[PDB]
Design a binder for this molecule. Structure first.
Ligand SMILES: O=C1c2ccccc2S(=O)(=O)c2cc(-c3nnn[nH]3)ccc21
Ligand SMILES: [Cl-]
Length: 260
């Protein structure tokens, strides 16, 4: 499979939309990641590309070029490869150590904080969108459902992303308005829980009960592995079900587990 100067190889990931394939560029003799999309509405992909074109940061993926012929049904986004892949698979029986989780969480904070400064709400923070680069650091991937905003926060009404990671205030069925920065914080908390426990804090195979637990089940910590109380404190604050009192990113940065 050859698309201009690129040679498509095997699938390496499957995102919110198309697939990602390893691609080899014959010009410069280099591997890239290629998101492959087929027109199935189509507006949102060019919102994604616009957001991508604006982002230049070491903890965010780098869009290299877009291949769009008006005649072929497929559309290609070329990203710089992030070779080690997702930071972890969820669920797992081998979660990260606290020191590992701290290391990666620190990257996650700097990226989210950059995104929020650039006025992007990511809306799909989770371990499989956190890719480990050549140097061992995290890069945030997949802006397929992200939101851009004007002013100091986003004022959202739609429900998107991955169910297990959706903040409770995005799950009223009366179409209410909710702010966007707190949605990313919630997902960071579910993510940090996954790092150290290897599974999600709210699991159910019936979607109705997964929503019910997210909205109404008190956060429970497993006996094993026994984690530090300050890490418990931080997760508890990020998974505060009330977005008004949920911890903000400038406070997360100062948290004693984080600076430890
Ligand atoms: O290098 C990537 C990679 C490398 C190894 C394994 C798995 C992936 S990957 O498919 O998870 C991915 C996804 C994106 C992406 N960014 N925005 N939408 N998709 C960009 C790069 C990569
Ligand atoms: Cl995941």
């Amino acid at each position: 499979v050859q698309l201009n100067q690129y040679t498509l190889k095997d699938e390496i990931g499957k995102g919110s939309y198309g697939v990602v394939k390893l691609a080899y560029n014959e010009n410069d003799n280099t591997y890239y990641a290629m998101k492959v999309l087929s027109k199935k509405p189509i507006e949102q992909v060019y919102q994604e590309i616009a957001i991508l074109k604006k982002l230049d940061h070491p903890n965010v993926v780098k869009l290299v070029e877009v291949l769009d012929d008006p005649n072929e049904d497929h559309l290609y986004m070329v990203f710089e490869l992030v070779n080690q892949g997702p930071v972890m698979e969820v669920p797992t029986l081998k979660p990260l150590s606290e020191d590992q989780a701290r290391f990666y969480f620190q990257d996650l904070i700097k990226g989210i904080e950059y995104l929020h400064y650039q006025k992007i709400i990511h809306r799909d923070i989770k371990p499989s969108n956190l890719l480990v680069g050549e140097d061992g650091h995290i890069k945030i991937a997949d802006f397929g459902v992200s939101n851009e905003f004007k002013g100091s926060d986003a004022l959202l009404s739609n429900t998107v992303g991955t169910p297990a990671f959706m903040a409770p205030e995005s799950l009223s069925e009366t179409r209410k308005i909710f702010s966007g920065k707190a949605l990313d914080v919630w997902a960071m908390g579910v993510t940090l829980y996954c790092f150290v426990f290897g599974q999600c804090p709210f699991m159910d195979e019936r979607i109705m009960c997964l929503h019910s637990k997210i909205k109404s089940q008190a956060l429970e910590f497993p006996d094993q592995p026994d984690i530090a109380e300050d890490l418990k404190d931080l997760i508890t604050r990020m998974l505060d079900k009330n977005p008004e009192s949920r911890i903000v990113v400038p406070e997360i940065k100062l948290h004693p587990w984080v600076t430890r």
